[model samples]
Target: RIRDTPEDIVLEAPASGLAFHPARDLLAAGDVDGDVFVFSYSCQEGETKELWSSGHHLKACRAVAFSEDGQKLITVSKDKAIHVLDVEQGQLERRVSKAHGAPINSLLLVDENVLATGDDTGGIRLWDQRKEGPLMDMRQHEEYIADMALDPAKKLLLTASGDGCLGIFNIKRRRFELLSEPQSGDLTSVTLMKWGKKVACGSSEGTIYLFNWNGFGATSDRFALRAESIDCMVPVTESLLCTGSTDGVIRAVNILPNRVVGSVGQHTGEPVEELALSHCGRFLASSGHDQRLKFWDMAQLRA
Candidate 1:
């Protein structure tokens, strides 16, 4: 097992998720304390400008994402509900109550009207936003589904779980494709690199397990990060992977060299709970137990 800085600025509340709008340089922050915050950002601004807030999540908001058309924002909460927010005014456009029986930790947009969510338990559900209930529900994991990533074609949903395994959901088939063989420790985070050419999993023991082939349960290489635990990760480039860990640090690792080059930034000794890459590939936003959301420039992310 292994254990875990960056031009980072701070927000007022701790966020469980940070998402960038695909068409605009805007951000949506899912506050753990219970709100979805929208911000206008740019390299010129140097600081984020809060535009509006949607206070629909009565409890912690765990995930946020912008719609393909850029008109709507989706927020998933621990209270078993998902709120659809208006991107411009931050109003509640719609709400899916009791979206799941267990606490949902993550969400991925399949398309404009369809979305997929993973729960605290080993459950993944698919819903059509305009409808009443889940179109499909899956029980592929045996523990908390910590994170999810999509293939370049957006046909497969990759998952990292507390059960120490990785999973794949085939959207085309509307069922689980396969489950990976268990790792040496809990798999806390997962990311897709170069579409589906490469994939990475971060474990509770601070180990990064890399997989190249499409086959599950097999690994190509592995790297040990001598920190605490890698709880979150986002791809910076094809060869560079960034991670957040219980050690309260954000680090950038080189995949080809199998070495951590340096720190991207830090969370002032608090565990970095979440990290996200901008849709434009220019900024990275992160939040931690310190109750602050920070932004980092992606100058060092380029290969």
Candidate 2:
């Protein structure tokens, strides 16, 4: 396992969501107090400055995202609302209250204009920022929709649930397809590789399963076991996988070789709620029950 050289930045509340701008060097995090913190970081020393903070919800912010163009910031909260913000000015643009019947747990910007979100009530709603209301509402999962992912092309929507299943939906066709049923674990997160051909899913049982997708069927090729329940997992590259766990560990593994190469710890307080990688892959951010936000310098590792 890879050990992290911890650099903790204390916060007033625990973070529930973390995200980085798609084309810039800025990072954004959402906390339990219904606030969002935006930061600017320097790779040279792994230092960060809080650029902005805003209170935009009545409940905890569970998910955050930057538009593909990095012009807009979106956050979903337990108050069942989706708030859109102007990233350049840190101003609240619009609020879609009751976007879902239940708390939103995940958000995905499929493209510059199209966005998707999944909620605890098993609803997946699609939005076109240019329009007034959701373009599509697909109620597929019967259990909590904990996470959502879109392929590189943004054509397929993948969702993982507390129901122990991963559901793949065709965005164009508006249809649901069963990707895999783990038989015994609660699926927490699902993310597509940058290439879009593969998916990595993390489970509450401390396991990660990798799948290959070709439009017909998804094939499971490998499973990476962790010491604690995994809260999130992402495919950084074709061969690199990163995971955050309840045991307060963040690990980077080389997938093809199936070996854990690097790890960082110190999340001992509670489960890690979110994990995000910068678009340039030069930094990693995580937030959890510890009521802190942590940034990792990944430039050297990428080098």
Candidate 3:
């Protein structure tokens, strides 16, 4: 299923994170130099032009994401603040300091009105756009909260942490639901499958663990990779996933087969900081610490 390789795009700053707009032909990335860069992606033009670079935070921007409506961009930094930027004309919407006293590592726009953030010291907080402060802080993890995901209904929030565990919260009910049994390696990222049928977890020890959505406290399927760490991942199809590792390799792994099916080499032989899939699932973007943002074809991710 793999065929054409897309050209790699190099940036002046190292991108720590990247995300595609849920409703538009746009991509955004958080740079190590404290900037959020948004690029317009057109299938027709076939090239990118910077829409804006935000200067809201003075420290390295950890992550950037678009609200569900595609009008707002949420940027978080190690400076312990969360910034909201209007996308159209590149204007500042709101800036919240002390969103967490610790360095914020991840941000998820739960819905148009709700946003959630996780910090390095293992704290998670939910915010309502209409309200000034967090609606609820579901603080629990003792280490870095690596990543977060939501179910299709957007009512349940799941977080993966550096503490080798996962946290599930009932957002609508405003309560924490469950914590997964500790994995042998530190959990790095978590995502739900296409139909929300299964949960996949990546680890620092280069292992991928699968869990049944209804099953708790155990591993359903386990996969091991030769890479140093499974740093990030994004689903590429209903039964397939793309994983980016600390070794700078992007691999496509089939869930049912539980093995490496394909891979593309564009990153500079270092850690692939983030992985983002376009809304249509045709393009897979990789942000690397080597100062490159590369695109791989779904059918042509070349190793």
Candidate 4:
């Protein structure tokens, strides 16, 4: 998929998950075999090395996230387990053997002690590292929770669902706030844009539905792309974002102007599974069904 790129990291199986460390040159990559690998990467040519790896689940590892300090790595699996690992050694610190009733699909670390996990059954659960049980749990959709986005300033955790809706939850209040009305397609990924004044959710139908910050119950706008399905996305700037689609391409899209400005890269004919931007916003990492992780130099895009 990522030809002519020496920065590509090859895995034994299709990479299903990825997370860039919040404050370092580290990346936590996960495969369908349920193994987690940590690598230190650099802008230098071919400068990437595996730091540590572990196999903790029997099923596919769907998503991963790192705490603010970059000391703790959180991973979730279709095996329905959640593992917290020390980034220094890649060893398990503590784990919830069965974190959700359904296969966990996405995760977001709100803070050192607070995190959120979403499942295949559309279940959303908040957890505090200091506790044994979920701080709050709710299920508002009938399908998988495809992705989650955080608006830290407002303490909101937004979830995009395969059931064609977006859910807003108050992380600070520990309560469910709103579930938008069903839209034209399955909501695949979500991110805040326009400085948190706008919320965008990518869909299986290739439409990005936009919502106003306060009007979370309904769509405020929609932008359609040629790609049939948008599987994942990451914000490049407040108004710009990149989308991974079934078309095997990565597109740079702008919010207010509602345009697909340019291409970042592609995965041949394989659908991209996940995307992660580095903490410093220097590199954009993407995983796909091709069993490879590719890094793009964001500096080129910015320039």
- Mind giving the per-residue lDDT tens digits that candidate 4 earns over 41-126? 86567577899997977798898888888788889999999998899989998879889999999998887788899999999999
Clashing pairs in 2: 2-262, 2-263, 3-263, 4-263, 4-264
In model 2, which range of ten residues has the least summed lDDT? 1-10
Ten-residue region with minimum lDDT total, candidate 1: 1-10
The lDDT ranking, best first, is: 4, 3, 1, 2
* TM-score of structure candidate 1: 0.92
How does residue 66 of candidate 3 score in lDDT? Answer: 85
Maximum-TM-score candidate: 4
Q: Give lDDT for model 4.
A: 0.88
The candidate that achieves the highest lDDT relative to the unseen native structure: 4
For residues 1-303, write the lDDT of model 1, one tens digit per residue: 211122344666788878889888787888777888888875543444678988878898998989999999888989899888888899897888888999889898988878889999989998886787888899979998888877788778888889888898888788878888888879888887754677889999999988884866777888898787898888888778789988789998887678998888888889998887877776778888887767776875574
Off by over 4 Å in 4: 1-6
Better of 1 and 2 by lDDT: 1
Report the lDDT tens digits of candidate 3 across residue range 208-256: 8888886746778888987879999888776788888877899888776
lDDT of 2 at 224: 54
